[PDB]
Amino acid sequence: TKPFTLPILTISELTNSRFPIPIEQLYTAPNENNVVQCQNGRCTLDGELQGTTQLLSSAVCSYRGRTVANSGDYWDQNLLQLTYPSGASYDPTDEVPAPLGTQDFSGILYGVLTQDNVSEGTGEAKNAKGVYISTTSGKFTPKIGSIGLHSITENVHPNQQSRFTPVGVAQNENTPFQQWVLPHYAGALALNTNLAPAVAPTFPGEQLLFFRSRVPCVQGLRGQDAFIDCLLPQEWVNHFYQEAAPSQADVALIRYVNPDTGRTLFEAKLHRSGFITVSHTGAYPLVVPPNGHFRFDSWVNQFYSLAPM
Amino acid sequence: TKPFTLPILTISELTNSRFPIPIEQLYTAPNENNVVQCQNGRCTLDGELQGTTQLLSSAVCSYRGRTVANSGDYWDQNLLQLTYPSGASYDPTDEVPAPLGTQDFSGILYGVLTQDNVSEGTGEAKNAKGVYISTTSGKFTPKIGSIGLHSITENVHPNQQSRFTPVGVAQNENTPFQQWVLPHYAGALALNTNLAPAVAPTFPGEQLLFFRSRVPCVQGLRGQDAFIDCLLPQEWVNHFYQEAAPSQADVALIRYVNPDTGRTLFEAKLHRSGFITVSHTGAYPLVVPPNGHFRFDSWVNQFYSLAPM
């Protein structure tokens, strides 16, 4: 039986699985009213990708396809007829919530659309268009293969093969950024399908442990931080996919260790569905040694008692 | 002794190590007048990172720091005084060619600068500034901890903590995109230092094999492609770093296989310094089967004679 392992990576060597930026810190908090059901960065410990999860950070919140004119709409002047960010054709009957890498938070995603290359004499950055992709728009239906593009300053051409590169997130006065409210992948008139399950602590005193990043915010949240919290770093997703080690229990005991001193800084529970819990009550940003990393200890029973941290 | 392995990844499951976009195909050509000395995606088979190579694709061609106003009527309206991912000033005495992840191609890099968050009422994408970072500017001195920012869209504010997210590449009438001309990391008046070595075939009939991507081009190259070719995909760099398997010969004989049939499509030499050669004469794009992947076969010496492909 292939033993289960974690990659040996420090907190500065991890990528957020829900937005293509590095992990900044570990963070724990109670769920209070949030339903924690993100769809990117979802992978079982034995290597089954779930939700909209794929292997490349450069595909997370990225889109590719062909633009379609949508003149007359207030918000979305054009649509993007999607494929997978792979470039492989997208079939709405695929058993996924949306094309892999589709944004899994509610609100406005900001990025740059690139289209057919233009001549040098056309001018600077004339094949770059700043664009909003909002999930509250009626045209956000990636499950059906089409999303709406809100142009900001630059003209988006119809009928051109186009690539959307994410840059950050946005918040205006009627569209709050809500990282734990799933989009309606098929529009407000249809239920989501093929979702990775919601996660929550099930042992007394435990809280979810998140891998936290601050995403750039191009509008709103003055003096505040746009946080995107993921359950697994992209590197863990890819490691579990590569290894496909059979899971021997619902929960694995893991430790954050200093490899030079051998000290366990804290213990945590790694759950089969692909998330972590720690024994703590309250919102708490962890600070962890630059050389520290998680290590797999053993498979334990669901009601194993972690050392408080 | 820890056996050497490659990750099991198809061509579309690989990330370019020189720009955060997926690999699309393989490519081989003679060096003729190109000095092949890229500094990102450089890693020995036993896991030693070289040049400016680090582990996160989300850090390649990404920059962070504090803006400083630049006087005069010239190309760069602002400078970016660089900082580590923690916010501490960069150290020019580090034995590296430049901060890790610095762009290693000459020409114009395009992306979006984000700064202090602005209120919701300030307007759409008002904390997003489209920007050119040109290596032919006298202000491109990342080794010294400062790069020049040419504003295109939105005003860049000085004295603000800022992040640069890369989107693509550009070419105007006097700045060609030259992927094999290393930038002068300390400006045009200083020699590069601490470089990973240039690579070339040394066995008769062999050519370098590259992992090839098409990078978005926001100005120029109409009807043409901006290619970025790397020696190793980011996933191979990270795998070798993780495994740190001792190299047992000068060359790891590797084989591209189609798992549906078990058939070998071609074989290649994976040199212990971290680059691939194949037996071929001429420029040739390799459209590889989408389900295929490289596999490590065995250790051989530098005088192994590859089967021509």
Numbering used by the authors:
A (entry chain C), B (entry chain A): 3 to 311
The article reads:
Human noroviruses (huNoVs), members of the Norovirus genus of the Caliciviridae family, are the leading cause of acute gastroenteritis (AGE) and are associated with almost 20% of all AGE cases worldwide. The P2 subdomain is the main determinant of NoV diversity, antigenicity, and glycan binding patterns. In conclusion, GII.13/21 huNoVs have developed a novel GBS that interacts with glycans via the common β-Gal through a unique glycan binding mode.
OIF P domain was reported to bind Lea antigen but the GII. P domains in our study did not, three reverse mutants of the GII.13 (SC1065/2016) P domain were constructed to explore the role of these amino acids in glycan binding. These included a single mutation (N297Y or G361E) and a double mutation (N297Y/G361E), aiming to restore the Lea binding function. Unexpectedly, oligosaccharide-based binding assays showed that all mutant P domains retained their original pattern of binding to Lec/lac/mucin core 2 glycans and did not bind to Lea antigen. Also, the single mutant N297Y and the double mutant N297Y/G361E showed stronger binding signals to all Lec/Lac/mucin core 2 glycans and particularly to mucin core 2, while E361 showed the same binding affinity for the glycans as the native P proteins. We determined the crystal structure of the SC1065/2016 N297Y mutant. Also, an attempt to shift the binding of GII. SC1065/2016 to Lea by reverse mutation of residues 297 and/or 361 failed.
